[PDB]
Amino acid sequence: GSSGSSGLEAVAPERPRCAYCSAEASKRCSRCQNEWYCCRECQVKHWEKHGKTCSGPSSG
Ligand SMILES: [Zn+2]
Numbered sequence: 001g002s003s004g005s006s007g008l009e010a011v012a013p014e015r016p017r018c019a020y021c022s023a024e025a026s027k028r029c030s031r032c033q034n035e036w037y038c039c040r041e042c043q044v045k046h047w048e049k050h051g052k053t054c055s056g057p058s059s060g
């Protein structure tokens with residue numbers, strides 16, 4: 001080879017966490033996209049607490 005490998009280390013992925021059940025989240029708040037929620041329901045239950053700061057940095 002020419003470039004070769006950079007280094008050999010345990011490289012593992014990562015994932016967010018729900019804001020209601022604290023479970024592996026996949027989608028973020030479609031309102032501010034600053035929060036995480038495994039399911040839509042959760043994003044609705046924690047709303048009371050989320051909506052508080054929700055809609056932070058307004059953006060398309
Ligand atoms: Zn959840």
Ligand SMILES: [Zn+2]
Nearest residue numbers: 029031032054
């Ligand atoms: Zn939000």
